[PDB]
Structure formats: structure tokens, C-alpha cells
Amino acid sequence: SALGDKAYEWNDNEMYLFRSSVAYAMRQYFLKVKNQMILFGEEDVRVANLKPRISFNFFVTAPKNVSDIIPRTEVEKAIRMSRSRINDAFRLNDNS
Amino acid sequence: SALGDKAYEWNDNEMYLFRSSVAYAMRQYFLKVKNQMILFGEEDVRVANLKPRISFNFFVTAPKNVSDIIPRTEVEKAIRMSRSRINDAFRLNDNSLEFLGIQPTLGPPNQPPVSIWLIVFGVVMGVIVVGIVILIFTGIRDR
Amino acid sequence: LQFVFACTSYAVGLGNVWRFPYLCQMYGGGSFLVPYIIMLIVEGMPLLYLELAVGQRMRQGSIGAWRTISPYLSGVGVASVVVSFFLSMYYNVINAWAFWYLFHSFQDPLPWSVCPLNGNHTGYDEECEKASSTQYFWYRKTLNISPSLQENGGVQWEPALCLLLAWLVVYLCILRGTESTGKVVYFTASLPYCVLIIYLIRGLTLHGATNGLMYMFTPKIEQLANPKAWINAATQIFFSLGLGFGSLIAFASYNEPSNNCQKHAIIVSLINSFTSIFASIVTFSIYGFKATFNYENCLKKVSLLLTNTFDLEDGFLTASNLEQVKGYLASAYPSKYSEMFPQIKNCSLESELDTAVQGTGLAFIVYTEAIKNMEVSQLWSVLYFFMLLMLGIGSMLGNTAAILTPLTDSKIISSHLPKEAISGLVCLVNCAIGMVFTMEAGNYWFDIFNDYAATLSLLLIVLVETIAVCYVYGLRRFESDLKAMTGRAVSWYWKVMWAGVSPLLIVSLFVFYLSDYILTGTLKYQAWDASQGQLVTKDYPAYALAVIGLLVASSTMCIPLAALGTFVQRRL
Amino acid sequence: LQFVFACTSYAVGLGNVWRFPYLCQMYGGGSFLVPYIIMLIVEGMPLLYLELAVGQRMRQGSIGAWRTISPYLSGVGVASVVVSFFLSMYYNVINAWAFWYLFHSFQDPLPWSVCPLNGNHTGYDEECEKASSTQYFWYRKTLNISPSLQENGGVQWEPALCLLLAWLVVYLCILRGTESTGKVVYFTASLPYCVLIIYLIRGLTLHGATNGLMYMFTPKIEQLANPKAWINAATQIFFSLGLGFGSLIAFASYNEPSNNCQKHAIIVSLINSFTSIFASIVTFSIYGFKATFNYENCLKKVSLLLTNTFDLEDGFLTASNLEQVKGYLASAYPSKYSEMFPQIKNCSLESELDTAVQGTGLAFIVYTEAIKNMEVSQLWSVLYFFMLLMLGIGSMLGNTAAILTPLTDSKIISSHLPKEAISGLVCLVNCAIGMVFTMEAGNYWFDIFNDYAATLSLLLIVLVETIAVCYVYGLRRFESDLKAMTGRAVSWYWKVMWAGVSPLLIVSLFVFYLSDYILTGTLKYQAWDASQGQLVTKDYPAYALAVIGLLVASSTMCIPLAALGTFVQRRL
Ligand SMILES: *[C@@H]1O[C@H](CO)[C@@H](O[C@@H]2O[C@H](CO)[C@@H](O)[C@H](O)[C@H]2NC(C)=O)[C@H](O)[C@H]1NC(C)=O
Ligand SMILES: *[C@@H]1O[C@H](CO)[C@@H](O[C@@H]2O[C@H](CO)[C@@H](O)[C@H](O)[C@H]2NC(C)=O)[C@H](O)[C@H]1NC(C)=O
Ligand SMILES: *[C@@H]1O[C@H](CO)[C@@H](O[C@@H]2O[C@H](CO)[C@@H](O)[C@H](O)[C@H]2NC(C)=O)[C@H](O)[C@H]1NC(C)=O
Ligand SMILES: *[C@@H]1O[C@H](CO)[C@@H](O[C@@H]2O[C@H](CO)[C@@H](O)[C@H](O)[C@H]2NC(C)=O)[C@H](O)[C@H]1NC(C)=O
Ligand SMILES: Cc1ccsc1C(=CCCN1CCC[C@@H](C(=O)O)C1)c1sccc1C
Ligand SMILES: Cc1ccsc1C(=CCCN1CCC[C@@H](C(=O)O)C1)c1sccc1C
Ligand SMILES: *[C@@H]1O[C@H](CO)[C@@H](O)[C@H](O)[C@H]1NC(C)=O
Ligand SMILES: *[C@@H]1O[C@H](CO)[C@@H](O)[C@H](O)[C@H]1NC(C)=O
Fold it and tell me: Which of A42, C453, C535, D74 could, after both became Cys, cross-link C526 (CB 3.0–4.6 A)?
């Protein structure tokens, strides 16, 4: 829809890049708001229900604590802050 | 130089993003060229000599093998392939992300297919000769 | 009414816009305006109006006027004719260049806007880094100027054929003879100014344009010391007014012998000076903008080099604090700083401004610069090139009307030859002799024919005319406060120039010119020097001196020949 | 020569550009083109030429002509004057709207190009996804049309204004009286066509334009059945040519009594038809483009909804394979497919094309659509609006000349009243009575004054005129094939169309129209229905029927009044 042509194939590397970007956004939110240093990693972003539509569910946990789940509201706020920086990473325009 | 204003401050998270992007580029090169499956990680991109100019040396190793250093030429090829995808990640335009050994060049501009000046001068010279001939003929006819 | 003024506008030409700004730039700007004002207020008016009066009263050509005054005085018209023909050959090349630029102004993106890439396809040409895109286009794309005058190459293909096209255009305009009109002249006189307003607006709306204004306005002291400015200004004003060519006299003879010629002269001079000043303003605004841009680029390059070397934080090193940072860095690391010093450059705003673009084709390499940052470049480019073309065509039409008229009375040859055939032969001969400005080194020949010792015999022609008027045949027996000049402005105080100080004025700067010629004993011409990208000075060869000497002699020795030609008949 | 054609080009008006395409769209397009031609050859030409000849031969005003023929035929001119007045009141509002659009065409970015956002600031207004930006601008920003005629609101501010400013412009144009000219007519006639070429070019460069042309050319069967298309085409051609107004006759009087009036009539009719056809081409191209775009959006929305619902790969589901994928998905998961079936829509190109934009202001909402996708919208917008304004001004000048003439002869009042005061009083009276068209539901009243019971008496005027001609006063006692009228049109078979078929044709469609009027027993006016974004039909109220009946009766009973007046003379 966005690129029309020259669209890169969505392989595992794209998912890795997406997870790293999400972790970067979470780090930025926890640094510039709560004044805390949390070292998130790409393994802290759990993904599920991968679809050919490139649609999936995801969530974020503590750096090394499986039994700790970040509440959805804070993740939503972080995504709100860093959506502009996420968009150009994949050449998308907030409509795709 | 690139953004001028609204430039984000360079903190550790930017370095993390850069390392992840480099690992992604290396994965792409090792997948789409040599047909091998290598799981690079951000911890396999060693960096050193950080300066306020945002200048630093770096290199890449094997997934879990310290004594294995990827030779420089393959890294150069991977960067050459994925520079376009790296540049827009940080909103740079290849003028503020020089790699000191990789110069960009793609697309020789060759616009003119017909040399418009030649055909324009041709039509003008044709019209001027026909005009001068018809005028001299009219003058002769008018004695 | 307004029709008289619209008709009188025709006095503007391709010397006020093409040639005046180049001279103004060449001699410092502000130091060049005041001699122009003096020469206009003391020299142009008396000679112009006296001529006009002579043309009105004599009712005949300049040759017949010379016969009326003195058989010895014959030949001045012949010298003026030769001067006009010499002017015409190198004049038409300006129209040729205008045609070339107009034809090339149809491509997109426009040329002289981007630079050809190097053979590596990894960067731009080093010549473009040295000389800007406009300079590269005007020196290598359209002229291919040789490094030195001594070196010469074969004739080129585009300039020759374009010159031919312009010459046939001139020939057609002569043959049609559809010059008489009364309504389109309004449009032809209004187009130049209305075209110039757009460029004035764009020049004034750009950053740094005011620096050009201070440069061209503020006079200097050292520049005024040189005498060559005075002779150059006198030649410029003579060329612009056109006196001494024998064309005015004609016109005046054409019109009815009852008109206030003095009002015509003053209204011509005022509009000429005003148009010249307006054009100088418009050009120098863009020139100052370009100089400021180059100075900023110099500062940016130096800043980038320093930042890369010393790894200073970006943006911290600004233009204002350059000296403090330089001193602090020299203190911090004196050894490597001293080693790097020779590699360091220093921006110089003043030297850059007074010498940024120079040479004959200044107006071509400035406005094209302005073209490269238009909203729609092609439109205004076409309008400006069309205005230049029409002005050049009008000027060519003139000096032709000037050349043809004396040869028209030659019934001895015209008895078996129609005037059209003679005009065509003259046009072809002049086109052929103008071919010498189309090789890789013809540009230097063109500057010699236009600037260096060019049309200087006009000064001696005017001097001879005024001394002839000052004799007993003038204001003592003939033109002695007669009623025939409409009974007004009869023997007023204006004589104190045209019968008084003006002759001396002619020799006052001539003596300075000849004194400097022998004192210096050296002449320098500008060379392109593509190896660096800036013009340099070189010495003229001996044969150049010989050819310029014979050129001035050809118009100098005419009167002594007529003296003997009359004395031989007087003997019997 | 060319001046004759330039003068006859004043036959063009707003009945060719603003009203013809609206009617063409209203009645199916192609099915409306063919009757017009049949009503062009047999109806307009003979009646127009006969009138013109009668006006030329009579050499006096229409009222005096009627008195000369018989006291029985007196009064028809009064009905014509009343008809012209009623036309003018609702005609000036078009100029008012054009002024409004021109005034609003100065902003940047232009309106009707982007849509105002919702009160949440997150999305667009729901009205915009219902109706496009141009439709929203024309229906809510500049009209604020009420949902129904029964609903009423206060008189608005901006329309009344535009109407007042336009009316004072018209009054000034009347007072100056600078109608006589022979040089500007070239420009006033060249502007319309030259402006239309640019829009034709743009329409041809837009995707999907061919479908609009095919729609406008291909006739239909269902539309041709109704007689209302025929009567509306007859009214359209009558209004465009101007029969029954009494202005042509008056023109003739000034015209020199030596000219082939048949040549004039054919040369005006052909020009009018050609201009109308050209305008219809230009409008329907853009209309087809808009319809195609809406159809594509309809397809895209359904495709996106299906892809999101069933998680199909993007780009895989195309328009070509839509039906196959629909059937396959219905087969695969019938339950939830049937559940969400009501959310599916079918994109019907034909039904979207025949009903895409409708109503009176079609020409306003189409060209503006063609404006928002131009490189420099403001330029062509200004040219188009200025052309519309000047054409409306000329038409209003003609109407004012028609209305003013009968009141001029009233010496009883003009003895102590200047003509300027009478003209001003008439202008203000017409403006005040036309204030109703500036009120919130006034658009319905405007459509009433334009379509229903509007200018229907014109056919009756034509019928009584040709009946009077068919009597002894035509071809039998007066104008009996006399040689006085240049010896032409003397008992030619041309007389046949104005003595044969046409008088029968006046009543041929009348009976058909009144047959359906009573048989159907229903009548619908279109309304905006902002809740959905599409026009819907509603029934006229009783008082609307009463008012249109009174309006038609006001022009109907004029003849019986004259009959009663002359009955006393008839009896004795
Ligand atoms: C990992 O996360 C869990 C839950 O966030 C932490 O458990 C907290 O501490 C005790 C442990 O039973 C509970 O009573 C608290 O309710 C827990 N807090 C919350 C918000 O649920 C656990 O301590 C964490 N472990 C580490 C090593 O960080
Ligand atoms: C890590 O990379 C080094 C470098 O290749 C590997 O060391 C080599 O081991 C092979 C046999 O496996 C020897 O033939 C080479 O002589 C070794 N070095 C060289 C020069 O390649 C090492 O095996 C890799 N893996 C680990 C766990 O260290
Ligand atoms: C830049 O720095 C200064 C300013 O021009 C130059 O230093 C000059 O060095 C010359 C040669 O010894 C001295 O004669 C001058 O006195 C120094 N300063 C001046 C006033 O010029 C230096 O050469 C410049 N670097 C360049 C031009 O490359
Ligand atoms: C146009 O789209 C409508 C959508 O309603 C379709 O109408 C359906 O008609 C079928 C039978 O032909 C019914 O079984 C459905 O209940 C209707 N759709 C609904 C209400 O869900 C129709 O398929 C399309 N074509 C026409 C001519 O209407
Ligand atoms: C000033 C004036 C007053 C009445 S005429 C007249 C013109 C003489 C100078 C114009 N050119 C003379 C040659 C150079 C040319 C240029 O540099 O462009 C200008 C003449 S002379 C014959 C016709 C006309 C208009
Ligand atoms: C056709 C013709 C031939 C000679 S005149 C003339 C014109 C009559 C119709 C024009 N309008 C009549 C009213 C409506 C208007 C419009 O819809 O725009 C057009 C007249 S009548 C008085 C002046 C002119 C030019
Ligand atoms: C370009 O020319 C050759 C080909 O790449 C190369 O060796 C040389 O270094 C380059 N020099 C430039 C930049 O002109
Ligand atoms: C927008 O604002 C209106 C008015 O308060 C409100 O009714 C509606 O729910 C809002 N819609 C949103 C939040 O998009």
C-alpha cells in the first residue's frame, strides 16, 4: 500500500529489526520520563500469531524476569512518543 | 550538518540502534549472497574510540566466537548493499554518514536524447532560408 | 506628448546594459561613477547638441558638410565609416552569443545549473570546484578558451554557424526595410524596463545583495589615481551616445529644420544615464549575492576542515568565534597546528568581492547565475535573451544604416549594380572577416577589438571636428549668432564648453594616457588559467602591438592623405 | 468579414455553458442530445428568422407593431416584459455566486481542496466521506441548504451581499451606457473559447475521460420515452436563442434595413449550437473522470475491508479477480461471510456514472474539481470565474435593455422623472424581490424559478406570434412575398416550417406533457439530505403548487384582458 513497488520481502531479519526498534523506544521512554536505566533487549519483545498480512501480537517484559509484564498503558505511551522515529525505519507513513 | 535543527541528542540508545542495524545488514549479506544462516547479535559488533564528533571504530565477529573476526571486505560489501536502508533509519542522507573507504555512486544522469539545440537551430535556419528566398524572389518580381 | 518621449527612448542600446556594468566592475565600482558623471555633464551635452545643430543646418551628409567647411577637411566621414565597420564586425558576435544562449535555454534541467560528473562517476569535476558552474559553462562549454593567446586552435563549429545565422537575420532585416512604424515602438521601448523590474526584484530579495551596492557606490582613493579610468569612461560614453559615427548627423538631417534640438539632447542624455545606472544596480545586486555566497562557502570549508582535524563538537565552531578557537587550538597543540597552518586558508571578503567574476562576458555569467535560482528559470531566461536579441538587432540595424548611406550615393558603381546586391556583398564580406572570433583563442582578439585601444580614434575625430568648428569659420563668420537656429538658445553660455574647455579636456587625459603608456611600457591581458580557475595576467606579443598600431593608424592618417589630394589639384 | 462574426458572437451566454450541461446530465446525456438537434433544425431556425424579418420590416418597437397589426394582438409585449423581469430577478443570482467564488478563490491553500477535520482533530468530517470536498463546499459553505423545503431559516449574510454588489455593478454598467464599441469585441469573444481549450486539454489528460464521452454520446431508450425531456429541450433552445423576449425585434429596428436576415439567423444558430456542444464536451470529460475516481475508491474500500477481515496477502486481491475470490471465500467460511455480507457493497460503474453529481450548480462543482488538481490552481480559477462574470454581465445588460425600453416612452412620468432615477428604482425593486434566493431554503425556490413553471409561457408567446403571422397579415395581404426585402425568401418552401409543422409542434408536446402531468399525479423536487450525502426526492407542498399556478396565470390571462378591452370596439 505504501511503497507500491520495490517493497522488500518480510523475512526474519525484518522482525529482528522491528523488535530492536521497539526495545529502543521502550528504553527512550523509561529514560526520558521515569529517569531509570533499563537495559531492554530484542529477546524481551515476545511475538505471537504471525500472519501473511504481516500482522502479529506482541508484548514486552522485564530485562531478565519472565514473571514480570509491563502494563499495556506504558507501552502505548512509549509507542505514541516514538512512532515517528519507528515509521521512517521501515519507510512507512503511519497509514501502513 | 544534515538536520541543522531538531537534531536528537546522541545517547547510548542510538549506539544500540546502530549496532542492531549493522547486525541486520550483516545477516542480510550472509543470507542473500552466500546462502548461509548466521544469527548475528548486537553483542557481536565491537566498538571503540568514541568521540564527541560521533566518530568511532568498530568491527564484527562470529555469533559466539571471540577469536573469529569477519574480514573487512565482506563487511564493506554488506555496508555497500544496505547503506540505503541504514541511512533513513537515522534520517541521514549519505553526506553525514561517511564510512572512510566507501564512496557512494549509482546512476549516471544522461538526459538529452536528441540534442534539442541542433533541431531548434535546424528549424530556424530552414525558416530563415525560405524567408530570404521568398523575399528576394518578391523583390525581383517587383523589379 | 508621450509619443515624442516613446520615440526618443530608442537611444538605449546594447552598450548601456551589456558593456557599462563590465567597465564598472573592472575599475572598482564607486571609483568609476564620478568620472562618468563629470564626462556626461561637461562633454556629452556640448558635443551632442552641437553635432545635432550641425546636422540640422547642413541638411546633407557628413561628406558634404566637410566639403562646405574645407576641402582639406575631407575624409572625416570616411574615417567614421571605417570606424563603424570595425565596430560592426565584433559587434555582431554579441548577437551570435545571445542566439546561442537563447537556443540552449530550452533544455531541462537547464545547463550551467549542475556540473558534469568526473570520469569516475563518483564526484564532480575539479574545474567546477575551482570555477563555478556558470564560469565553466561560459569558458569551456561555449568558448573552450585556450590557456594562452599565443596558443591557437582550429575554428569551432557552433559559434561560426550561429554567427552566420545572426548575419542572415541582419541581412533580412535590412532587405525588408519595414522599419517605419509608430505604434509597436511603445512596446519595444517598454519591454526592456518591465523585463528589468523582475530581475531587480529577485536580486533585491536575495541575501547579501546590499554588499554589492556598497561596493559599487563607495568610491576609493587608489583606484581614482589611475588615469585609464578617465579614458575608459570617455570611450564608454562616446560609444553609448554614438557621436562621431555619422549616424546622428544623418538623422538630424532627415528631420524638419525647425525643432528645439537642445531639449532632444538633454532628454536623450538623461534617459541614457538613468538606464545605465538602473542596469548597473540590477547587475551588481546579483554580483554581491554571488560574492557573499562564495565567502560563506569558504568559511564553511575552513570550519569543516578544522572540525574534522581536531574532532570538535559540530556547531560549536561558528563563524564569529573563529579567531578565538584558532588561538586556543594553536595554544593547545602548537606543533601539529603549526604543521597544518600552510594547509589552512583564510577567507577574504573584500578581495573576494572586488575580484569574484571578471572579463567581457560578465553580464552573461551573472544573470545566468540568477537564472539558476528562479521559480521558473526558462520563462525569465527566454524573456531576457529575447530582450538582448532585439536590442542587438536594433543596434545592428543602426550602424548598418550608418555604413550603407555613404556607399548609396556611389552612382558610378550603382549604375550597373543594384543596392540589394551591394548590401548583400557587404554583409557577406563582414561576416567572413568576423570569422576570426570563433577559434579557441578568438576571445582575446575580441577583447582587443572591444576594450584595448578600441575606438580610440573616435577621440581624435571629435577633436578634429571641434578644432575645425573653433576656427574662423566657426562663430566668427558662420554660425555667428544667426537667426537660422530657430532664434532660441543663440550663442548662450554653453559655448564655454563646445568652443572653450572641451578641446583642452580632450588632450588633458590624452597626455596622461600617453605618459602612462611610455612610463609603464607594459600591457597585460587577462587569461583564463583553467589549471587554477582564476584569471591571470599575461603579456601581449609583438605582433599584437603591430596590429593594434596599424589599426589605429588606419583611422589616424586619413586627413593627411586628403591634404595632399587637394594640394596636388591646387598646384595646377 | 471578421467584424460581423465578432459582433454576432454576442449570441453566447450562460444558457450555453451553465444551463445546457446541467440539463444534459439531468436527462441521461445522449438521449438528450438527439432531440435538441431535431428541435434545432425545425423550431429555432424558422421562428428566429421570421421574427428577425418582421422586426426589420416593421421599423418600430414590438408594442407599436402589435398595435399596427390589430388591437386584438395588443398586450403580448407586456407579457414578454414581465417574463424578462422574472428572468432577471433569478438570473442575477448566478452572477452573485460567481462573485462569491471569485472572491473566495484568493486564498492559499484553496478551499474545496482539503476537508475540515472533526472536532476531535484526529479525523475528517463525516460529511466529507459522505460527499466530496467540492460538494460539501457548494452545499454547506456557500449555501447551507436546509434538509427540506419546509424547514426555513433566517436570511443569510454572504449571499445577499454578493447579490447587492452584483446589482450595483449592473446599475453602473447601465448608467455608463458604454455598449457601443468595435475593438474590444474581439477580446470578449476570444476569451471564452481560449479559456475552454485549456480545460479541454486537462480533461483529455485525465484518466477515465473516455467513459464520460461515451455516456454523453450514447443515447438511451428509457429516457427518450418521457416527453418532459422534449419540453425541457424546447425551453432550453428558446431561452438560449431568446425568442419571445421582444429584444430581437428591438435590435432589428436599429439595424440597417439591408441584410440577409436568413444568413444572420443561420450564422447565430450554428455558433450557439457549436458552443453548447463544445462546452458539453469539456464538462462531461471532467464529470467522467470524477465518476471513474469514485468507482475506483468504491472498489478500494471493499478490497481493503475484505483483506483486513480475512487476512489475505496484500496486493493479491485485485479488481479483476474480485468475483472469484468473493465466491471462494463465501464457500470456504459461509457462516461469518454471511454474517458480514450486509457490509459488502457492489461498485456499479453505470449507476454511479448516471448519478454522480446532480443539481443546478453542476458547472460549479465540476470545474472546481478540475481546478484542485492543477499546477497553479489560482490562475485558471481566476480566468474561468472572470469569463463567467463577464458573460453574465453581458447577458444582464441585454436583459436590462429589454426591460427598460417599454418604460422609456412613459412621458407622463418621465416629464418630471429622469431616466436614471427610474433605472435605479427598477434595479432596487428587482434586487429586493430577489432577496428570497439568498435565504437558507432559497435554492429550492431558485430551481422552481428555473425549471418548474419557468419560462413556459414562452411557447405560448411563440404560438400566438406564429398564429398572427399565419393570418391574412402574412403572405396574403402584408409581407406577401414582396420583393422589397431584397427579393429573397419569396414564397420559398422554407415558409413551410413556420407555416406548417412548427405551429402543430407547439401543441404536439404540450398535450403529451399535460397527459403525464395528470396521469402520474406526482411531482418531486430534489433535496440535499446531508445525513447521507445524496440527493433525495420530496413532494412539493400545496402552497408551492398555488404559487407556480399563480405565476403561470399571471402571464396567461394577459391576452383575455386585451380581448375584454377590445370587445367594446368589436361590438360597436
Ligand atoms: C519478577 O516480577 C515479579 C512480579 O513483577 C516480582 O514479584 C514481586 O515480588 C513478590 C514476589 O512474590 C510479589 O509479592 C510481588 O507482588 C511482585 N510484584 C508485582 C508488581 O507483582 C519478582 O520479584 C520479580 N523478580 C526479579 C528477580 O526481579
Ligand atoms: C572460531 O574462529 C577460529 C578461526 O577460524 C576457529 O579456529 C580455527 O579452527 C580450525 C578448526 O576448527 C583450525 O583449522 C584453524 O587453524 C583455527 N584458526 C584458523 C586460522 O582458522 C575456531 O574453530 C572457531 N570456533 C571456536 C569455538 O573458537
Ligand atoms: C592564513 O593565515 C595568515 C593570514 O593570511 C597567513 O599567515 C601569513 O604568513 C605569511 C608568510 O609568512 C606572513 O608574511 C604574514 O604576515 C602572515 N599573516 C598575514 C597577515 O598574511 C597565512 O599565510 C594564511 N594561510 C594561507 C594564505 O594559506
Ligand atoms: C449488491 O449488494 C447488496 C448488498 O445487500 C446485495 O444484496 C443482497 O441480495 C441477496 C440476494 O440477491 C441477499 O441474499 C442479501 O441478503 C443481500 N445483501 C445483504 C442485505 O446482505 C447484492 O448481492 C448486490 N447486488 C444487487 C443487485 O443488489
Ligand atoms: C542617441 C541617438 C539619438 C538620436 S538617434 C540615436 C542613436 C545613436 C546611438 C545608438 N547606437 C549607436 C551605436 C551603438 C549602439 C549600442 O551600443 O547599442 C547605440 C541612433 S543612430 C541611428 C539610429 C539611432 C536610434
Ligand atoms: C441571439 C441574438 C442575435 C442578435 S442579438 C441576440 C441576443 C439574444 C440572446 C442573448 N441572450 C438572451 C437572454 C439569455 C442570455 C443568456 O443566457 O446568456 C442570452 C441579444 S438580445 C440583446 C442583445 C443581444 C446580444
Ligand atoms: C578517477 O580516475 C581514475 C578512475 O577511477 C582513478 O584512478 C582516479 O583516482 C580518479 N580521480 C579523480 C577523482 O578524478
Ligand atoms: C469527538 O468529540 C465529540 C464531542 O465531544 C464526541 O462526542 C466524540 O465521542 C469524539 N470522537 C472521538 C473521540 O473520536
Answer: C535
Judge whether B87 is closer than 8 Å to chain A, CB to CB. no
- PDB experimental method: cryo-EM
> Resolution of this PDB entry, in A?
3.3
CA separation for the pair D520, D498 (Å, rounded): 33
What would the grid cell of residue D56 be?
A: 426589420
Amino acid at A84: S
- Which chain D residues have a beta carbon less than 8 Å from that of A51? 311
Instruction: For residue D70, give the amino acid letter.
Output: S
> What are the cell numbers at D162?
454578493
Identify each DSSP E strand in D391-523 by its residue range.
Answer: none
Q: Find cell 458539453 and name the residue.
A: D280
User: Can you tell me the distance from the alpha carbon of D19 to that of D35, in angstroms, rounded to the nearest whole number?
Assistant: 17
**From CA D104, how far away is CA D107, in angstroms rounded?**
7
Chain B residues in contact with C107 (beta carbon < 8 A):
111-112, 116-117
Residues from chain B that touch A11, judged by Cβ atoms under 8 A, are 31
Are B52 and C311 an interchain contact pair (Cβ–Cβ within 8 Å)?
yes
A91 touches chain B (CB under 8 A): yes
Contact criterion met (CB < 8 Å) for D311 and A1? no
D534 is written with which cell numbers? 445524496
Under DSSP, the state recorded for A57 is: E
For residue D571, with 0-12 CB atoms within 10 Å meaning exposed, 13-18 middle and 19 or more buried, which class applies? exposed
Burial status of residue D170 (CB atoms within 10 A of its CB: 0-12, 13-18, 19 or more): buried
Write the DSSP symbol of residue C34: H
At D522, is the secondary structure helix, strand, or coil? coil
DSSP H helical ranges for D71-148: 76-104, 126-130, 133-136
**Three-state SS annotation for D199-247:** HHHHHHCCCCHHHHHHHHHCCCCHHHHCCHHHHHHHHHHHHHHCCCCCH
Q: Is A95 in the pocket of ligand 1 (CB under 6 A)?
A: no
Cα–ligand 1 centroid distance for D426 (angstroms): 91
- The reply to whether omega before D109 is within 30° of 0 (cis) is yes
**Ligand 7: residues within 6 Å at CB?**
C 118-120, 123
Chains that touch D (3 or more CB pairs under 8 A): A
The CA distances from residue C530 to A60, B102, D277, in Å, are: 64, 30, 65
- Which residue, judged by its Cα, is nearest atom 27 of ligand 1? A65
Classify residue D494 as exposed, middle or buried by CB count within 10 Å of its CB (0-12, 13-18, 19+). Answer: middle
Name the one residue in this structure whose C-alpha cell is 594616457.
C513
Q: Report the candidate in D367, D39, D323, D405 with the shortest Cα–Cα distance to residue D196.
A: D367
- Amino acid at residue number D127: E
The length of chain C in residues reads 572
Farthest-apart Cα atoms in chain C, separation: 98
CB proximity C103 to B under 8 Å: yes
Angle between helices C457-470 and C542-556 (to 10 degrees): 30
Pocket test for ligand 1, best of A64, A65, A70 (most atoms within 8 A of CB): A65
CB C456 within 8 A of CB C551: no
Chains that touch B (3 or more CB pairs under 8 A): A, C
Round to whole Å and give the CA distance between D169 and D162.
11
How far is CA A43 from each of CA A23, A31, C447, D30, rounded to the nearest angstrom? 9, 20, 76, 68
Q: Is C343 in the pocket of ligand 3 (CB under 6 A)?
A: no
Q: How far apart are CA D266 and CA D274, in angstroms?
A: 12
The cell 370596439 sits on which residue?
Answer: D569
Phi, psi of A46 (to 5 degrees): -85, 135
From atom 24 of ligand 4, which residue's Cα is the shortest distance away? D346
Residue D47, C-alpha cell as written in the block: 421562428
Ligand 5 residue neighbourhood (C-beta within 6 Å)? C 10-11, 13-15, 241-242, 247-248, 251, 268, 395, 398-399, 401
Task: Compute the nearest-CA separation of B117 from chain A (Å).
Answer: 36
